[PDB]
Amino acid sequence: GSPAAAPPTLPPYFMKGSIIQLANGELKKVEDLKTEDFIQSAEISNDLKIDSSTVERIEDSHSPGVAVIQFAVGEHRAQVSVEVLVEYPFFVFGQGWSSCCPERTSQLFDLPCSKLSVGDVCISLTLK
């Protein structure tokens, strides 16, 4: 079948040394974020909730530098296949920042990443 395409640009906070303001008034550098920062920040926020998507499959795209990743999204495991840039950092539950290509994420952002793998649970924040 035909995957959905992800946004073709990356947001700026992935740049190492950027500082996030969490819904606990706390400030952390992006490279220092932990899983509990998201969970606690979501818990406190009246607007945001935590959700998650599990990596089911990673395949090469026909475009070089792009992966096709199959996700199982949220508690009913809705199946979504998306084209994503290999440098895109996902935040993996109990791991931290992870990408299809850590070396490229290092080149672009200086953000240390683990290699994204099948079974990884990626954290997201969505509106209520």
CA distance 40 to 56: 26
CB within 8 A of 76, min separation 6: which ones? none
Closest to 99 measured CA to CA, from 7, 14, 21: 14
- Per-residue x/- track, 3-42, Na ion (CB under 5 A): ---------------------------------------x
Q: Is 98 in the site for its own copies (CB under 8 A)?
A: no
Residue matched to tokens 């296949």:
81
- Per-residue x/- track, 1-40, its own copies (CB under 8 A): ---xxxxxxxxxxxxxxxxxxxx---x--x--x----x--
Ranked by CB distance to Na ion, the top (closest) residue is 45
Closest to 85 measured CA to CA, from 74, 69, 96: 69
Q: Is 45 in the site for Na ion (CB under 5 A)?
A: yes
Q: Is 79 in the site for its own copies (CB under 8 A)?
A: yes
